[PDB]
Design a protein around this ligand. Structure first.
Ligand code: SF4
Ligand SMILES: [Mg+2]
Ligand SMILES: [Mg+2]
Ligand SMILES: [Mg+2]
Ligand SMILES: [Mg+2]
Ligand SMILES: [Mg+2]
Ligand SMILES: [Mg+2]
Ligand SMILES: [Mg+2]
Ligand SMILES: [Mg+2]
Ligand SMILES: [Mg+2]
Ligand SMILES: [Mg+2]
Ligand SMILES: [Mg+2]
Ligand SMILES: [Mg+2]
Ligand SMILES: [Mg+2]
Ligand SMILES: [Mg+2]
Ligand SMILES: [Mg+2]
Ligand SMILES: [Mg+2]
Ligand SMILES: [Mg+2]
Ligand SMILES: [Mg+2]
Ligand SMILES: [Mg+2]
Ligand SMILES: [Mg+2]
Ligand SMILES: [Mg+2]
Ligand SMILES: [Mg+2]
Ligand SMILES: [Mg+2]
Ligand SMILES: [Mg+2]
Ligand SMILES: [Mg+2]
Ligand SMILES: [Mg+2]
Ligand SMILES: [Mg+2]
Ligand SMILES: [Mg+2]
Ligand SMILES: [Mg+2]
Ligand SMILES: [Mg+2]
Ligand SMILES: [Mg+2]
Ligand SMILES: [Mg+2]
Ligand SMILES: [Mg+2]
Ligand SMILES: [Mg+2]
Ligand SMILES: [Mg+2]
Ligand SMILES: [Mg+2]
Ligand SMILES: [Mg+2]
Ligand SMILES: [Mg+2]
Ligand SMILES: [Mg+2]
Ligand SMILES: [Mg+2]
Ligand SMILES: [Mg+2]
Ligand SMILES: [Mg+2]
Ligand SMILES: [Mg+2]
Ligand SMILES: [Mg+2]
Ligand SMILES: [Mg+2]
Ligand SMILES: [Mg+2]
Ligand SMILES: [Mg+2]
Ligand SMILES: [Mg+2]
Ligand SMILES: [Mg+2]
Ligand SMILES: [Mg+2]
Ligand SMILES: [Mg+2]
Ligand SMILES: [Mg+2]
Ligand SMILES: [Mg+2]
Ligand SMILES: [Mg+2]
Ligand SMILES: [Mg+2]
Ligand SMILES: [Mg+2]
Ligand SMILES: [Mg+2]
Ligand SMILES: [Mg+2]
Ligand SMILES: [Mg+2]
Ligand SMILES: [Mg+2]
Ligand SMILES: [Mg+2]
Ligand SMILES: [Mg+2]
Ligand SMILES: [Mg+2]
Ligand SMILES: [Mg+2]
Ligand SMILES: [Mg+2]
Ligand SMILES: [Mg+2]
Ligand SMILES: [Mg+2]
Ligand SMILES: [Mg+2]
Ligand SMILES: [Mg+2]
Ligand SMILES: [Mg+2]
Ligand SMILES: [Mg+2]
Ligand SMILES: [Mg+2]
Ligand SMILES: [Mg+2]
Ligand SMILES: [Mg+2]
Ligand SMILES: [Mg+2]
Ligand SMILES: [Mg+2]
Ligand SMILES: [Mg+2]
Ligand SMILES: [Mg+2]
Ligand SMILES: [Mg+2]
Ligand SMILES: [Mg+2]
Ligand SMILES: [Mg+2]
Ligand SMILES: [Mg+2]
Ligand SMILES: [Mg+2]
Ligand SMILES: [Mg+2]
Ligand SMILES: [Mg+2]
Lengths: 137, 148, 231, 208
RNA sequence: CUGGUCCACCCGUGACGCUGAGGCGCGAAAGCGUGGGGAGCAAACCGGAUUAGAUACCCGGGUAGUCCACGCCCUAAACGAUGCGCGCUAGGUCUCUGGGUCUCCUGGGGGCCGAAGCUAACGCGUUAAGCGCGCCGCCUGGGGAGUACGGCCGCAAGGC
RNA sequence: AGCGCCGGCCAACUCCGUGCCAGCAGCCGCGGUAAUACGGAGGGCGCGAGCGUUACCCGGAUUCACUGGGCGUAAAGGGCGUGUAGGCGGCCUGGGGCGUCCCAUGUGAAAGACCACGGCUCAACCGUGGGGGAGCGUGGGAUACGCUCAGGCUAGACGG
């Protein structure tokens, strides 16, 4: 594996398209900090440190919409969209003043900064920029 | 009742021995200019029969779009096969800046201030359908907070 | 009105010929045959009937759908006993979605009911008589349970959602709720109020339809004793 | 310069009465009140559905033909309104209104803007004292638009003031009759005028 | 004599990994050089038919070549017209080959039908053309043209 | 008062004349005796001391695609390996602080541009004022990620 972070976001995105109750990602002290923001901003029901075959994992409990009317009774997503911004191929750095407003306000840009993992809102609050991790809505 | 606008009228032909035989199609959008729009594509052996039929489907397929002082809430991009439509929020003084097809939709939808752009295939039929699915995916601050 | 001896009548069947969505209801696979949790079945039986019971004391229509051999006659029993429309033979395409034109054909049935109610012109051609009398036999075979239906149902009840996916689709398109008995081969998500149980043993078809039809009349005025059923 | 031609053919094309003459406009000898159909050989032929473009051309031509103004100056104002803060439609309409020849016609000093121009052009008008012969002057709030006294004692101004005794003039305008002098109070809200023009469509014309 | 590979055990090393501009090797058939071999087959070629003609298709012959050694050539519908590695996203069935307790479960390959999703459609679908990250190669209207000029390779044919 | 245009794009329609002729033409295409498409006329459209043409630049062109594209059959995966440089890289804990982010500070001439006012009777033009940014030098600050050094782990990889 070459991008641990992206893999997680992809594990989540894929798992939500079939409405899994939960899903497992290989653990990391940085993946957690991200997952923390993901839970507080209300994208996921939460997470917990599990083990798979003696190996550390993070189990993520997925959150969806209500049962729906019509031919497609599939509920809406809570995470409609999640994808890497910065990459190993190309590191994306933004100063505070150039931090983008995800979906006119309805979504967040998770960012890694020299003052912890913050959202776009929090970055302007704390007054710092950094590597743009991903955007989610 | 709602206001009707014909978007497209086209002739198509099929083949049989002794010649080609025709059929007309009608793209029809319908709206109240208060946040409720409908799009229907009507096909029939003649022109007015087809337009009528489109209007019937047009009402049979609606979508309640959340205007906010005449503009959509957030930016939306939808691809329908080959065609792509872009929608962007705009200030009061802006007006509607759109191609004829998404314009017809957004005027009857009551949208008065929006920036748009067509991309990819500009097939009117497909562009039309694409724009609806974009509207159908617009969500409010409430809708976003409500889900989470 | 429920029970705990449904395992004394079905507990489900069918092998690894399943729908993977139904997994949440299955307990184990026994003799190479998926066995449905009956505890799970009742839970829904509660939920399902609660919906039915609300519809009964509001007095709203129900459509009974079942055309497999196992549920062939056993619907005509329970449906008339509830006095509500059913389909026993071939479920015609578009009965709900194209109701106006489908029902336009029942007015021919009622038209044949008129003429062959004696006498009005038996001096009509011998071939003409033969045709219409034959035509009556035909219509009766398919439309018997559908004439009772004079408006679009508030819900429909199905024996096999897989077998009657056509029906389920129409109801889905018309926002008409779908209540259904369904074993492991069926799509759970496609059904609103689900009865996860055997849909082949004429035992379980009886228990589920009857106790439904029992629940039907019970909130409509009175109760009755068990219904006719060939063992 | 300006259009300077047969003016009734305009209205007949626009399908609306544009009150471009003054007196004759209200008489039943009006062009519209006799022939409400387009000028030329084919005016009575049954019209075919006007293209999306056609609609926006007309509305712009309408708003422009109202002011008797050249397309350049029309364009330039629109642009100035396109850069300037707020609802572009409002600012454009206001800027079109703040023209001296228009203010002169509005305060009723003249019967037609066409006539209102020559009054400005021939020095017959003044602002805050000084003489102005420029039909394009940008009237601000606080501008005292008066008739030059050397032009006060003239028939044509009298006849036209003799009609301005009790005619009310917009919420953004004041007037002192007899003294032949008025004032520009503020920029006209879109509400203040009910011009036969959906000005949103004008913006949309230029966005091509 | 010798390569790759799979399984089981879960014993050893401690990120030693993935991709890969150049480079290097390998590279079906036909073709070339030197020397063998040569039954059958068979470009070229000869004849017999067919035909308007038949420099073909069919028939009787038939030399290179097809075979071996060593050395060249380096092309292709060299194809899955699908670059390699990795993670995640229902299952149903046929098959090959391992290991368990062998009902069956679990690996690694070979097909078919298919969830989700993709796609212009056809169709793909845990052997992805799904969802993602990394690296390389390649595309930018048809013809002119894989031609010309230059350069490098080749005995030449010719290749890049 | 002129100039261009009135088939579709694209706003503006009728008569005569010609008869694949004469001619029009940016693209689609017009004319072979019923032409809104040629020439003339009337009428109409658009601009206006200008109107049109040619030439070039950007735009439309998301048609070199960083924003923001593609390669099964549309143009496009190298015939296949092996590997150089390069690009990219698992989990944990520390040190450095290069990338990265923050603050202070210097520079970023004037004119132009943007916002406000003002001078020419307006405007064009011009004057006074205001807002700045990138980018680099400097000092101070931060450490999540990328980096680097150091010490560990076994999930990748390899070996028994
Ligand atoms: S008279 Fe005045 S209003 Fe009536 S047509 Fe002539 S110009 Fe327009
Ligand atoms: Mg980007
Ligand atoms: Mg809504
Ligand atoms: Mg399309
Ligand atoms: Mg696409
Ligand atoms: Mg907004
Ligand atoms: Mg295209
Ligand atoms: Mg096109
Ligand atoms: Mg069954
Ligand atoms: Mg001029
Ligand atoms: Mg007027
Ligand atoms: Mg504006
Ligand atoms: Mg008034
Ligand atoms: Mg523009
Ligand atoms: Mg070990
Ligand atoms: Mg060790
Ligand atoms: Mg390699
Ligand atoms: Mg190489
Ligand atoms: Mg070879
Ligand atoms: Mg060979
Ligand atoms: Mg040779
Ligand atoms: Mg040889
Ligand atoms: Mg020789
Ligand atoms: Mg030889
Ligand atoms: Mg021989
Ligand atoms: Mg021969
Ligand atoms: Mg011969
Ligand atoms: Mg010859
Ligand atoms: Mg031969
Ligand atoms: Mg031979
Ligand atoms: Mg030879
Ligand atoms: Mg030879
Ligand atoms: Mg030779
Ligand atoms: Mg081959
Ligand atoms: Mg093959
Ligand atoms: Mg292969
Ligand atoms: Mg190839
Ligand atoms: Mg090709
Ligand atoms: Mg490669
Ligand atoms: Mg075995
Ligand atoms: Mg397999
Ligand atoms: Mg398949
Ligand atoms: Mg599908
Ligand atoms: Mg794709
Ligand atoms: Mg198809
Ligand atoms: Mg499979
Ligand atoms: Mg494989
Ligand atoms: Mg593709
Ligand atoms: Mg060319
Ligand atoms: Mg070319
Ligand atoms: Mg060559
Ligand atoms: Mg070649
Ligand atoms: Mg050469
Ligand atoms: Mg090649
Ligand atoms: Mg022109
Ligand atoms: Mg024509
Ligand atoms: Mg026109
Ligand atoms: Mg005549
Ligand atoms: Mg001639
Ligand atoms: Mg010409
Ligand atoms: Mg003709
Ligand atoms: Mg003629
Ligand atoms: Mg002409
Ligand atoms: Mg022309
Ligand atoms: Mg010029
Ligand atoms: Mg260009
Ligand atoms: Mg570009
Ligand atoms: Mg790109
Ligand atoms: Mg492309
Ligand atoms: Mg690829
Ligand atoms: Mg290949
Ligand atoms: Mg090669
Ligand atoms: Mg290396
Ligand atoms: Mg590195
Ligand atoms: Mg790393
Ligand atoms: Mg470190
Ligand atoms: Mg630093
Ligand atoms: Mg400066
Ligand atoms: Mg001034
Ligand atoms: Mg200045
Ligand atoms: Mg600026
Ligand atoms: Mg600075
Ligand atoms: Mg550190
Ligand atoms: Mg280390
Ligand atoms: Mg390992
Ligand atoms: Mg090993």
């Amino acid at each position: 594996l070459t991008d641990p972070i992206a893999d997680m976001l992809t594990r989540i995105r894929n798992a939500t398209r079939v409405y899994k109750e939960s899903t497992d990602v290989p653990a990391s002290r940085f993946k957690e900090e991200i997952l923390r923001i993901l839970a507080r901003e209300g994208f996921i029901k939460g997470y917990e440190r599990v083990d798979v075959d003696g190996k550390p994992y993070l189990r993520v409990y997925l959150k969806y919409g209500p049962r729906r009317q019509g031919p497609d009774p599939r509920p809406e997503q809570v995470i409609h969209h999640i994808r890497r911004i910065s990459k190993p191929g190309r590191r994306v750095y933004v100063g505070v003043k150039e931090i983008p407003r995800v979906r006119r306000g309805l979504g967040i840009a998770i960012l890694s900064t020299s003052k912890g993992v913050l959202t776009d809102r929090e970055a302007r609050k704390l007054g710092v920029g950094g590597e743009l991790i991903c955007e989610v809505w | 009742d709602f206001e009707e606008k014909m978007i497209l009228i086209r002739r198509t032909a099929r083949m049989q021995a002794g010649g080609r035989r025709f059929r007309f199609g009608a793209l029809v959008v319908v709206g109240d200019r208060q946040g409720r729009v409908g799009l229907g594509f009507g096909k029939a052996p003649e022109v007015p029969l087809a337009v009528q039929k489109a209007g019937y489907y047009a009402r049979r397929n609606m979508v309640e779009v959340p205007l906010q002082n005449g503009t959509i809430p957030h930016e939306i991009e939808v691809e329908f096969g080959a065609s792509k439509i872009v929608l962007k929020p705009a200030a009061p003084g802006t007006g509607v800046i759109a191609g004829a097809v998404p314009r017809a939709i957004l005027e009857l939808a009551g949208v008065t201030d929006i920036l748009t752009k067509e991309l990819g295939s500009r097939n009117p039929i497909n562009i039309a359908y694409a724009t609806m699915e974009a509207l159908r995916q617009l969500r409010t601050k409430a809708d976003v907070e409500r889900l989470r | 009105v429920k029970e705990l001896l449904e395992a004394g009548v079905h507990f489900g069947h069918e092998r690894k010929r399943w729908n993977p969505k139904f997994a949440r209801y299955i307990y184990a696979e026994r003799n190479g045959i998926h066995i449905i949790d009956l505890q799970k079945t009742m839970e829904e039986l509660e939920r399902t009937f609660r919906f039915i019971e609300d519809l009964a004391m509001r007095g709203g229509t129900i459509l009974f759908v079942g055309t497999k051999k196992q549920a062939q006659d056993i619907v005509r029993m329970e449906a008339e006993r509830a006095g509500m429309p059913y389909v026993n033979q071939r479920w015609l395409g578009g009965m709900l979605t194209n109701f106006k034109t489908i029902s336009q054909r029942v007015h021919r049935l009622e038209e044949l009911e008129a003429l062959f109610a004696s006498p009005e012109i038996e001096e009509r051609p011998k071939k003409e008589q033969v045709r219409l009398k034959h035509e009556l036999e035909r219509l009766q075979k398919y439309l018997s349970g559908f004439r009772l239906l004079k408006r679009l149902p508030d819900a429909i009840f199905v024996v096999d959602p897989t077998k009657e996916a056509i029906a389920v689709r129409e109801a889905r398109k018309l926002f008409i709720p779908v209540i259904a008995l369904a074993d492991t081969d069926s799509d759970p998500d496609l059904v609103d109020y689900i009865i996860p149980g055997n849909d082949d043993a004429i035992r379980s078809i009886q228990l589920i339809l009857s106790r439904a039809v029992d629940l039907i009349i019970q909130a409509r005025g009175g109760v009755v004793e068990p219904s006719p059923s060939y063992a | 310069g300006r259009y300077i031609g047969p003016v009734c053919r305009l209205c007949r094309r626009e399908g609306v009465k544009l009150y471009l003459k003054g007196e004759r406009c209200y008489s039943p000898k009006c062009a519209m009140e006799r022939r409400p159909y387009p000028p030329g050989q084919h005016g009575q032929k049954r019209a075919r559905r006007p293209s999306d473009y056609a609609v926006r051309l007309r509305e712009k031509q309408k708003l422009r033909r109202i002011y008797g103004i050249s397309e350049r100056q029309f364009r330039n104002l629109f642009e100035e309104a396109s850069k300037k803060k707020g609802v572009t439609g409002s600012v454009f309409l206001g800027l079109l209104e703040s023209r001296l020849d228009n203010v002169v016609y509005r305060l009723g000093f003249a019967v037609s803007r066409r006539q209102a121009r020559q009054l400005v052009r021939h020095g017959h008008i003044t602002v805050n004292g000084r003489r102005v012969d420029l039909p394009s002057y940008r009237v601000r709030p606080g501008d005292e638009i008066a008739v030059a006294e050397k032009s006060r004692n003239l028939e044509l101004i009298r006849q036209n003031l003799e009609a301005m005794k009790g005619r009310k003039v917009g919420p953004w305008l004041s007037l002192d009759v007899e003294g032949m002098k008025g004032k520009f109070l503020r920029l006209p809200d879109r509400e203040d005028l009910a011009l036969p023009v959906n000005e949103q469509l004008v913006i949309e014309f230029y966005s091509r």
